Amino acid sequence: DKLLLANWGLPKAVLEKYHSFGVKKMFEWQAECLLLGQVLEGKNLVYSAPTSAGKTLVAELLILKRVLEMRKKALFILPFVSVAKEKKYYLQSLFQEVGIKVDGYMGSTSPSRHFSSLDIAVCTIERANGLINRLIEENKMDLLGMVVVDELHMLGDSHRGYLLELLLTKICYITRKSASCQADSNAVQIVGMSATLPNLELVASWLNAELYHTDFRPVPLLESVKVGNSIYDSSMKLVREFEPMLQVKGDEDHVVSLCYETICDNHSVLLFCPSKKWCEKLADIIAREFYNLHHQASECPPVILEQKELLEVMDQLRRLPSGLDSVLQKTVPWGVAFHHAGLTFEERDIIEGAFRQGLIRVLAATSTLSSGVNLPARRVIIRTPIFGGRPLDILTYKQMVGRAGRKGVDTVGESILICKNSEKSKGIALLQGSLKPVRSCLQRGEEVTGSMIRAILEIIVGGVASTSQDMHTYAACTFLAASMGAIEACVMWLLENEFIQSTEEGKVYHPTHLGSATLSSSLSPADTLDIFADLQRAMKGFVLENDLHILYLVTPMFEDWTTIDWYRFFCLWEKLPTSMKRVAELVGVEEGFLARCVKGKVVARTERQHRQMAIHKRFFTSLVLLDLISEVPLREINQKYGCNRGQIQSLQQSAAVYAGMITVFSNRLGWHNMELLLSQFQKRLTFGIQRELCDLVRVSLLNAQRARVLYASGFHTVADLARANIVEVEVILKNAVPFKSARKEAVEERRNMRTIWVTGRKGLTEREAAALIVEEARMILQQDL
Ligand SMILES: Nc1ncnc2c1ncn2[C@@H]1O[C@H](COP(=O)(O)OP(=O)(O)NP(=O)(O)O)[C@@H](O)[C@H]1O
Ligand SMILES: [K+]
Ligand SMILES: [Mg+2]
């Protein structure tokens, strides 16, 4: 009818891309969300819908609208780097045919093309907030046409979610300062979306946006809870008396039986488990039982139509900086796998693709995946309502059970929450539970608050708020004031700590050098005080014989990245060379405190002055980072310190970004000598390499491992690599592969095996990759001239 996608004036290049797989007609709620109101005119919109209902199409049609009609640039903001990268490639594939340049601002990644020569920028929260501030410093704010926010419910409380408010308030503040222009239409449109929030109307009013809400969902979700053999619904009514056709020993809350039942019916199952260790243990059991039950009585997958793709998955894992996991090597041949934060992001990209293609039918995951990328399944099983020793959060629950039901595939989506008689009441609480109202995170015996101090600093230093009148005008645009002193307290704080200047033109506020430095560094004003002192302390007495002391200055300690074994730490302390003990003493690492940690598990940290704990945690971390840029194997670092490869990769990408911040901060203060030393560690922390490999790693396909083996074989630079014979590069790459046996038959059937993974990847052969490396090296060599 009228909701036919071809009747919406869709460009042919995009219309076919939509018709490429499904997407011929729209939903009832999608048509009402666009037409009703002035949404297509330029009015802001805040809409909510259940997961897997088609929230993406609404935004896509609006973005494609403004970009092509108004010829302005769009901003897409996503919570995590993984979902941001996924969204980039998904939007690129649709719009590359219409000459629409789409790049991304994610974590440490930087766009090759300037923002001025783009159309759609995909960002995380941190990078988006920074880009906005960049446009303010350059006054090129007129470029921005609209901002799209995914998961608008992260506005309440998160590690970086509060920045979403400061970002939006900043947009609402600038457009209000332009409302006093008295002219004589569209400006900057804000499209926000989330899950069903109780105070969603409050959010739409704050942004002066039209509201929309629906409960529509193409596949019905059957939320249930299992106690023993019986399965009940949300009203405690029995919906199924489960009886295992076959039975095995073990814990067995019919967990294997439920999964086996699902696979036999040609479906797939997601199994959520509390700890990282349970996922691997359970994935091993299920795969083992799947072998016994099928034949009625760590190898290769059976010869089927999917044998090649199963082998490619196992081979791609092997040729990764992580190698092929021992448990995965056993389970994956039988469509079983696990998924947690312990794996590297590259391993998880493989498994999700495997599960999405049907190669993996059973996936035992953690709560990390529930908030990650889009990955649906027929049945979702939650092993227990007790996660991490604490009862499961309501938001986590709705994110898990929301992945039950594949649109266009399954008739229903089933959700089972396994409980006992004791925790029976807590399970029902989750099924009937609903999301809590979104807090402002700028709430006030705390007249001053971090989020506010940062918010006030950004508008003054940026030069969009000078007087005292501008400050309270900004206070009106906040989400905190939307629900209907503290502002004045934050301004004085910025004055007391040399962040801002006051010139009595009565009462006008200007940025200091320390102010302008903090803004350019994307640093929090609360953290900047200790960082500024730490740097001044380091410049009074600095160790240069090793790279440890420099690394300490760029070692992040705002969050715990692992659980440190203190006994292990003290063992490394004694074996620690004298040159590195000097750095420890010079920082604050006292041997006495290390002894009181191993002897007694007293965390203390109740006193604020107990940043003494953070110091030892920070020095422990710098040691890990030291070995990391010394090209020490991940397995050695794992055994030496007691942390998995997942925690390490999350740390280095965090330290790579942080290292860049401290470098900028030092540059804006005129500290050249300090800047000079730090400016080489951002690149080394990223790839985990030494100075020699810095030139090789410019090539996209070359990481730490591939760069070293090519260096040790005669290829030291890109220039040397452009002259390279392709088949020689291929051979050197083949030598870098990790095998359990001391490897490094003739199989000429593996000449087409795609065993090398990339980002936004087609499977690459070891030959094709080598030719790409030499081809890219030549293109770079020419751009170097
Ligand atoms: N208008 C539509 N027409 C046909 N199929 C659609 C439409 N919208 C979504 N889909 C299907 O849903 C799939 C993707 O899931 P989607 O509906 O986009 O979930 P979402 O709500 O946008 N994301 P999220 O809830 O955050 O996980 C698409 O690939 C389609 O198969
Ligand atoms: K690279
Ligand atoms: Mg969405």
From Swiss-Prot:
Location in the cell: Nucleus; Chromosome
Domain of life of the source: Eukaryota
PTM comment: Phosphorylated by PLK1; promoting interaction with TOPBP1 and recruitment to DNA damage sites.
Sequence segments annotated as region (Helicase activity): 36-475
Every Helicase ATP-binding domain range: 36-215
Chain ranges for the short sequence motif DEAH box as given in the UniProt record: 150-153
Residues binding ATP: 30, 49-56
Segments for region (Interaction with RAD51): 745-785
Domain Helicase C-terminal, residue spans: 250-475
Tissue expr: Highly expressed in testis.
Family label: Belongs to the DNA polymerase type-A family.
Recorded domain comment: The loop 2 region is involved in the binding of the 2 ends of resected double-strand breaks and homomultimerization.
Reported function: Low-fidelity DNA polymerase with a helicase activity that promotes microhomology-mediated end-joining (MMEJ), an alternative non-homologous end-joining (NHEJ) machinery required to repair double-strand breaks in DNA during mitosis. MMEJ is an error-prone repair pathway that produces deletions of sequences from the strand being repaired and promotes genomic rearrangements, such as telomere fusions, some of them leading to cellular transformation. MMEJ is required during mitosis to repair persistent double-strand breaks that originate in S-phase.
UniProt subunit comment: Homomultimer; forms homodimers and homotetramers. Interacts with RAD51. Interacts with ORC2 and ORC4. Interacts with RHNO1; interaction takes place during mitosis and promotes POLQ recruitment to DNA damage sites. Interacts (when phosphorylated) with TOPBP1 (via BRCT domains 7 and 8); promoting POLQ recruitment to DNA damage sites.
Disorder cited: Breast cancer: A common malignancy originating from breast epithelial tissue. Breast neoplasms can be distinguished by their histologic pattern. Invasive ductal carcinoma is by far the most common type. Breast cancer is etiologically and genetically heterogeneous. Important genetic factors have been indicated by familial occurrence and bilateral involvement. Mutations at more than one locus can be involved in different families or even in the same case.
Entry protein name: DNA polymerase theta
Gene name of the encoded protein: POLQ
Residues of the full protein shown: 67 to 891 of 2590
